[PDB]
Design an enzyme around this catalytic site. Structure first.
Site, PDB file in Angstrom:
ATOM      1  CG  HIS B  61      22.811  70.190  15.630  1.00  0.00           C
ATOM      2  ND1 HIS B  61      23.652  69.433  14.839  1.00  0.00           N
ATOM      3  CD2 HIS B  61      23.577  71.150  16.202  1.00  0.00           C
ATOM      4  CE1 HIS B  61      24.873  69.930  14.918  1.00  0.00           C
ATOM      5  NE2 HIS B  61      24.856  70.968  15.740  1.00  0.00           N
ATOM      6  CG  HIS B  86      14.726  71.630  20.820  1.00  0.00           C
ATOM      7  ND1 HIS B  86      15.140  72.139  22.040  1.00  0.00           N
ATOM      8  CD2 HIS B  86      14.954  70.289  20.872  1.00  0.00           C
ATOM      9  CE1 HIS B  86      15.609  71.176  22.814  1.00  0.00           C
ATOM     10  NE2 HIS B  86      15.490  70.073  22.102  1.00  0.00           N
ATOM     11  CG  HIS B  88      14.997  65.672  19.343  1.00  0.00           C
ATOM     12  ND1 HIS B  88      16.346  65.888  19.143  1.00  0.00           N
ATOM     13  CD2 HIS B  88      14.682  66.347  20.480  1.00  0.00           C
ATOM     14  CE1 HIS B  88      16.845  66.666  20.090  1.00  0.00           C
ATOM     15  NE2 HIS B  88      15.838  66.937  20.891  1.00  0.00           N
ATOM     16  CD  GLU B  92      16.788  63.397  21.525  1.00  0.00           C
ATOM     17  OE1 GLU B  92      16.746  64.303  22.364  1.00  0.00           O
ATOM     18  OE2 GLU B  92      17.817  63.058  20.899  1.00  0.00           O
ATOM     19  CG  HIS B 105      13.168  67.706  24.013  1.00  0.00           C
ATOM     20  ND1 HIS B 105      14.346  67.192  23.511  1.00  0.00           N
ATOM     21  CD2 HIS B 105      12.395  66.641  24.329  1.00  0.00           C
ATOM     22  CE1 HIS B 105      14.292  65.875  23.568  1.00  0.00           C
ATOM     23  NE2 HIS B 105      13.111  65.517  24.036  1.00  0.00           N
ATOM     24  CB  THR B 172      19.133  64.563  24.132  1.00  0.00           C
ATOM     25  OG1 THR B 172      18.549  65.630  23.354  1.00  0.00           O
ATOM     26  CG2 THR B 172      18.198  64.129  25.213  1.00  0.00           C
TER      27      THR B 172
HETATM   28 ZN   LIG Z   1      15.959  68.105  22.664  1.00  0.00          ZN
END
Ligand SMILES: [Zn+2]
Ligand SMILES: [Ca+2]
Ligand SMILES: [Ca+2]
Ligand SMILES: [Ca+2]
Ligand SMILES: [Ca+2]
Ligand SMILES: [Ca+2]
Ligand SMILES: [Zn+2]
Lengths: 222, 222
Positions: B61, B86, B88, B92, B105, B172
């Site tokens: 993920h 980590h 994204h 987001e 994040h 999230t």
């Molecule tokens: Zn995150």
């Protein structure tokens, strides 16, 4: 005989007079859409303002508030004296493709006539108590000018966060002269919807020049 | 068995397990489109970080970087220990309807398990020299975890302007637990297009939960 609408409008400004040629050939025009931004270590801008707004003029194109000598900003180690501030609606500048409903311009000049303009965005919010003092007394027709009862300090219309965007551009009204330092503040201020509506109604519509091509320019962000 | 695409994707997360019920009934979900903003006199956030990133995990993920104990932030006079950070792509969070191409994040936790996440937007720009160290070594498949040779300081991935947006939201990713303090930094950081493309390629596509309704909430701006 220039205007914001019709056949004497912004697209035709350069056709109207020889003196307005920059509105036609200029490659460093304002306003712009602030969408090519680069972080830069800009110096903070010294703002040495006193209470000094005296008159309120409706000139058909805006509401212009005149300022008595003695108030100034320091950009590039040079003193630029505040001469006047005035308004447009919706915003002349865009931020990443979006307008604010209103924008103020604080017009300054150094001893040799070089112009520096501070731009401040305003959003819908609380009544601006400083703008109410000017709005109460706002001349309804072109050519009219009222003297203010109480002197106003322009520093109260500026944000306390003084981070800003900078770029080299022009006046947004004819003659649209270039070589203007633009200081557009990142933090917006607030106005009531009623104050915005009053300004639009009295001006008779949109008071904003269309955004012009960035061209070779970048917008610096503090 | 949750994912970002298809029938185990974000719209169905709450259907998948009983433990994931907040993804379905929750009214304070993250991320959000940051478009209802109010100025607020938020305290600056103490960031007490040491060099302490140790491992890099691909979990299918995201890419998750784990941090050794001892690094923390102070929010509301409480110490929240940095556990991991980590990524994204695309962002987001949105800002006034627009994405950034990438978002990081930094996940923290106090002694009772209460979560505080710092969010950092990244735009296309110069290669991030701190991200290159992690990217060089980035595990290509889910389940894989590499030990880092040199410890990394997470503080170098944060901006020097530490003005931030704050709101009360959630994780999230499932279980999407609420009661999470979100600290989303106003100033973006930079990454190369190549670094973004590598992360997307290895993850196999978009790694962003859709924005969720703001609902009763406002976003505070420092
Ligand atoms: Zn995150
Ligand atoms: Ca920036
Ligand atoms: Ca700032
Ligand atoms: Ca404000
Ligand atoms: Ca604001
Ligand atoms: Ca930056
Ligand atoms: Zn103007």
């Amino acid at each position: 005989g220039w205007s914001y609408h019709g056949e004497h409008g912004p697209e035709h400004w350069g056709d109207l007079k020889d003196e307005y040629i920059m509105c036609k050939i200029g490659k460093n025009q304002s306003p712009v859409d602030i969408n090519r931004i680069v972080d830069a270590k800009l110096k903070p801008i010294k703002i040495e303002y006193r209470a000094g707004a005296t008159k309120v003029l409706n000139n058909g194109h805006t509401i212009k508030v005149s300022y008595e000598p003695g108030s100034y900003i320091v950009v590039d180690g040079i003193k630029f004296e505040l001469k006047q501030f005035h308004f447009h609606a919706p915003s002349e500048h865009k931020l990443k493709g979006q307008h604010y409903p209103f924008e103020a311009h604080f017009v300054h000049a150094d001893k040799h006539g070089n112009l520096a303009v501070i731009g401040v965005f305003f959003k819908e919010g609380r009544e601006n108590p400083i703008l109410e003092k000017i709005w109460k007394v706002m001349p309804e027709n072109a050519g009219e000018e009222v003297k203010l009862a109480h002197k106003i300090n322009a520093e109260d219309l500026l944000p306390k966060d003084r981070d800003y965007y900078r770029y080299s551009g022009s006046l947004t009204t004819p003659p649209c002269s270039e070589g203007v330092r633009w200081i557009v503040m990142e933090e917006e201020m607030e106005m009531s919807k009623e104050q915005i509506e009053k300004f639009r109604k009295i001006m008779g519509g949109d008071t904003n020049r269309p955004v012009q091509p960035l061209n070779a320019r970048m917008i610096m962000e503090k």
